[PDB]
Design a binder for this molecule. Sequence first.
Ligand code: A1IEY
Ligand code: A1IEY
Ligand code: BR
Ligand code: MG
Ligand code: MG
Lengths: 295, 295
Amino acid sequence: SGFRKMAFPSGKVEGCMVQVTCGTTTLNGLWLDDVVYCPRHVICTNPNYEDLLIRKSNHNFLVQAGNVQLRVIGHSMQNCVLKLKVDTANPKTPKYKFVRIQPGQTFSVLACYNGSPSGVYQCAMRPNFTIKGSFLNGSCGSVGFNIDYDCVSFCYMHHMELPTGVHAGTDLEGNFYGPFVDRQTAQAAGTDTTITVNVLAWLYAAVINGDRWFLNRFTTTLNDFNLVAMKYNYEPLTQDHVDILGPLSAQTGIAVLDMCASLKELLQNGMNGRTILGSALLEDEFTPFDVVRQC
Amino acid sequence: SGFRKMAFPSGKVEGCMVQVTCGTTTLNGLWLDDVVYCPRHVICTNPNYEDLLIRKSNHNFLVQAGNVQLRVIGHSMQNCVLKLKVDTANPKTPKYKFVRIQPGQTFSVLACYNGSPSGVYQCAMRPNFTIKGSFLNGSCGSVGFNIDYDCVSFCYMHHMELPTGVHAGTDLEGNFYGPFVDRQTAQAAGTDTTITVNVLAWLYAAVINGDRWFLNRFTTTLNDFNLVAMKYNYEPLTQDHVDILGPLSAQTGIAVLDMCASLKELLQNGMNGRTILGSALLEDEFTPFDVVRQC
Ligand SMILES: *C(=O)c1ccc(OCc2ccccc2)cc1F
Ligand SMILES: *C(=O)c1ccc(OCc2ccccc2)cc1F
Ligand SMILES: [Br-]
Ligand SMILES: [Mg+2]
Ligand SMILES: [Mg+2]
């Protein structure tokens, strides 16, 4: 029993983190096989990164894997990341993939400074393509990931913090999540919404854990629910979301539309001072998979 | 910016987790140098563990470090843990200590099943010596730890789940946290209280992150505050707690007793639908050190 914000074990990723310095700029890099990936921000001083990279030599890049220096033998830019070929393949390279996630999905973040991992925590990609992370100066290049069996699916590299305190980054192919750019502008996060399918998954988690006070005998229609969800700034719930919640509906014996009626009531009346799984608000950063994995 | 429940990187501990089987009972063990530590529960079938262990041979213990079997060459019981001497020292042994923590302190938990790490999350030792963990069948032997520089301070080994869904375990010397025993009784968690110094540290974290709506011009006395804290089931705040909060008080320019007046108001009036650091309730599982580490 119990339900916590649970991250994946970070060992396999810790073995891949390195430090990258170019000029007076230092940040984190990801060392997989004979390639080090890092944000192209490291060559900064409306910049034109194509020019900046042409004006650079392999010897301008100091790559340090702990107490060992790696020799850069080739550099190239892939969108907003840099690929630095090095003369040494990482002996700790796990089986891995580069995957881009969808809004509503979760991933574990290994916050790193000067190539040294500092902490690990769970994050969700918000509907507005930001993440509510925890990052200080020097965290550029920290990566987010999931694990399936033995394979590390990298999905996020950290770049910048937006004015509202939220964070923006790219996939490992260097393509930004959301309408953000790696330069100094007035860019701000767009209006966010609540991830409805996740709130429902979390309600199932509560039931599985013996928290049932919010349940009711009623059942609603998918239409009538979405009419209420939109009013409260919730994402629309689709039939695919219902099918995805299938396994949890079976384990608990509560039909999805039955749970949706409980959610509707919670939106319209609040919690009346009660809590669900130790929370006084509806949590939406647990996916259906996250619940099954932990329950 | 940002504030998350952040665990320590688990790599150094992942390399120490093994599987231990005796009879049809399998659970997790901690392999450090040439010793494997695990709960004495593994020799179970008001048991008398001294008898049970006398009736066992080194060959009755199957220890598997991944795909490699370890040969047990000696066994002994230290309170509620077992020490299984093996013919092979763990080459991945980090610098480590066995430390017992105080109620109110936090630690990272690496939940493990069949010797395989599954997830990592942050926990606090409650005033009643339970932890609100996330553990399923097979999690016996999962460990909690902190990291200081390169040294892993192990502080918890998981044993059992209590009726209310909370968890009880021991330090690595086999001594239980709280008045719990490793046998089947009606034992239940005692009444819990809120960790006041932690709530204050978390309020400082909010201020450091730009959440200031709860602040007020007032300041209270340590006496007058504790009179209110006791009413709301909060731990007493001591002058040592005030001194510990010193660094955060300096960084923010808010005297501790000034923050205590904000806390008093929050207890007496609630949050009026607002949130602090994304929470609608007063969070008490962040220590002052946790805040400094992350802010
Ligand atoms: C770190 O990797 C990183 C990446 C992108 C950033 O974008 C904002 C910015 C501001 C000023 C100059 C260039 C880019 C910031 C970072 F820290
Ligand atoms: C796992 O390691 C473990 C340890 C102690 C436990 O105590 C409860 C109990 C119940 C029945 C027989 C013996 C002990 C339970 C565990 F799972
Ligand atoms: Br909350
Ligand atoms: Mg219902
Ligand atoms: Mg005040």
